[PDB]
Structure 1
Amino acid sequence: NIHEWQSKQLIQKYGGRAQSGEVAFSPERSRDIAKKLWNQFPGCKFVVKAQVLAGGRGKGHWEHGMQGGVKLAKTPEEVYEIANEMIGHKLITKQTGAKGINCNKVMVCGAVDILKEFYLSILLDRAMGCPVIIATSQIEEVAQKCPECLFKVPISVKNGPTNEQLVKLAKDLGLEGDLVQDCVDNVKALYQVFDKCDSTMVEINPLGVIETPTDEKVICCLDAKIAF
């Protein structure tokens, strides 16, 4: 499986929208990324995301407390502080145990208004022998407590997804207006990645509805993981 930054760039290579930010291997560099971003959107806030091969970062904790592998920062100096407590230190989440996985890089992103967060993945379903799109706006828990809340769209491996399936899926997720077609185009892009890269899973957790700096609502992958 390829890292977050690399999957997102692959998704955007194929016409999808994703917040890949920029990766840093030192707190000095993390700060410089933030300072330069203030040239473009002055006053913006920042998000620092520990780049570790492990899930559930948002609710881990570090040696010196901290808590959470995804944290908001108001200034480049706050980016330095947070980054300095991530790089070269050990995060502890559910997927790691008391061991804790080491972190030697972070992702620095501009902070955006997140209006909605969905789960969406494109899986190779061996049983049926076809790709299947799995999405929900609420992943193993939701399927058991509310299986109806989960949508599974089998895909024709010769024709690919139909606009009918994708439009329905988008509306089933609660999207309206321009976000419906926006979601179709992004899901089409995710499928090309799935297909053209011979992936067994393209998982977007979360696929979000965010606001641009000028308040437009757009679909954007806020996380990405591609397996082969």
Structure 2
Amino acid sequence: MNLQEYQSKKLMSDNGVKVQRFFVADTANEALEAAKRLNAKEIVLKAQILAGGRGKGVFSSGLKGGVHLTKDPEVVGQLAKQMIGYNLATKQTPKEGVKVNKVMVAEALDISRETYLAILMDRSCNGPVLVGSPQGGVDIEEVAASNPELIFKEQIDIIEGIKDSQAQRMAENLGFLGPLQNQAADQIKKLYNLFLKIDATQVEVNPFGETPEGQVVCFDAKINFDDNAEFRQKDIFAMDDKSENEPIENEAAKYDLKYIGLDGNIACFVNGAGLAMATCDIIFLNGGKPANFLDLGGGVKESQVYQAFKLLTADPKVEAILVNIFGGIVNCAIIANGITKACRELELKVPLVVRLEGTNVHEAQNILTNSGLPITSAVDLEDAAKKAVASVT
């Protein structure tokens, strides 16, 4: 799941969480009118792309900076005209950049205090946990390194729900004072309820702070979603932005195949997540670089094999393919048949190293043998990895 800045903040504001008032514009004129409607003393214009570093990015129009500040609505429209339709290149994008179709026109807010606040499921404590620090605007992982005494945790009981004492105590530990502490405690409760409602794995607000005018605001936030809960989060998952994803990963998502593109030249699809991780491991240990991670699940069907091959063609770095299949009550001869079928029909001539363990192996070896295709049948996983590495440069 990937949400734009305006998508996540809309999701937060709809659930009582305080964020900057904002509009989203498709055109320069929409941005102009949105700027007027805000009635804000200062406006911030933000290009909407998923990658970071927008502030120091450059547009293909020549405009420097994807984040601009102004008190003039007309300037907002002018700058938006130099953003929308163009590509935004940052230090976290390809040099070509990413096409900007929408901009955010938000009320610019000053920040007096910056804190860190995160809500996630604690695998060890079996339930939601509040993670906070008075040191905000910083990668929290570094704070844990230098100053572990500044990381505060609150274990939440999922049935009991978040307690007022818990929300208040965290707000105090974050450094909020007086009415700002009460306002922060309330927002924490709203953030917790949002966390549960949208089936998030984590809701991370950074910075979680306050304006000089004395209001607690979630200035920036990141939301990670539980993929298992898509069936009951249809509206949210429909907002998914795949424009900054690896194209092969996107096509794999269509066929429900777990693909993660890598840096190597040895492609491999494997039934099972652990076995696939182990395959990448043992390929590396024998001096090779895996081109990808590809899990088909324990129940490996023939069509999944075909789609996998279809995916691996889109990767030009692929010089060899390691096929390792153990398990799933679809016999090996059927798998082997689907392998030969995909090889001829997809016009593939990279060498295959295939290890099949199950039933009808001898028949599978036969189907592989008389296929007249560059297919090597390995006996074990180490043998397969070595023969795959030997197949490439």
TM-score normalised over the length of structure 1? 0.84
Give matches, 1:129-208, under 5 Å: 129-136=126-133, 137-138=135-136, 139=139, 140-208=141-209
Q: Which has the higher strand share?
A: 1
Contact 2:54 2:90 in 1 (8 A): yes
Distance 1:18 1:25 in 2: 21
Q: Equivalent residue for 1:83?
A: 80
> Is 2:20 the counterpart of 1:19?
yes
Matched to 1:205, the amino acid is N
Greater mean deviation of Cα atoms: 129-138 or 20-29: 129-138
Measure the CA separation in 1 of the matches of 2:43 and 2:73: 8
Instruction: Report % sequence identity.
Output: 42
TM-score normalised by length of structure 2? 0.51
1:143 Cα deviation after fit = 2.4
> How many Å separate the matches in 1 of 2:123 and 2:131?
14
**Distance change (3 Å), C-alpha of 1:4 and 1:20:** farther
Q: Distance in 1 between matches of 2:218 and 2:58?
A: 24
SS in 2 for 1:31: helix
Structure 1 residue 205: Cα displacement: 2.4
Residue-by-residue CA offset, 1:55-78 (whole Å, 9 max, x unaligned): 3434434442513x3221121222
Shift of 1:168: 1.7
Q: 1:142 to 1:57 in 2, by over 3 A?
A: farther
Greater shift, 181-190 or 13-22, is seen at 13-22
SS in 2 for 1:87: coil
Q: Does the 8 A contact of 2:56 with 2:64 survive in 1?
A: no
CA distance in 2, matches of 1:51, 1:79: 15
Higher helix share: 2
Q: Which has the larger radius of gyration?
A: 2
Which one of the candidate residues 90, 93, 100 is aligned to 1:93?
A: 90
Shift of 1:92: 3.2
Structure 2 gaps, min length 5: 226-393
| 1:6-155 pair list within 5 angstroms | 6-37=7-38, 40-41=39-40, 44-63=41-60, 64=62, 66-67=64-65, 69-136=66-133, 137-138=135-136, 139=139, 140-155=141-156
Distance between the aligned counterparts of 2:19 and 2:175, measured in 1?
20
Q: CA deviation at 1:13?
A: 3.0
Partner Cα distance (1:60, 1:129) in 2 = 41
Is this contact kept in 1: 2:18–2:218, CA < 8 A? Answer: yes
Aligned-residue CA RMSD (Å): 2.3
The one-letter code matched in structure 1 to 2:194 is: V
Question: Which structure carries more relative contact order (alpha carbon 8 Å, separation 6+)?
Answer: 1
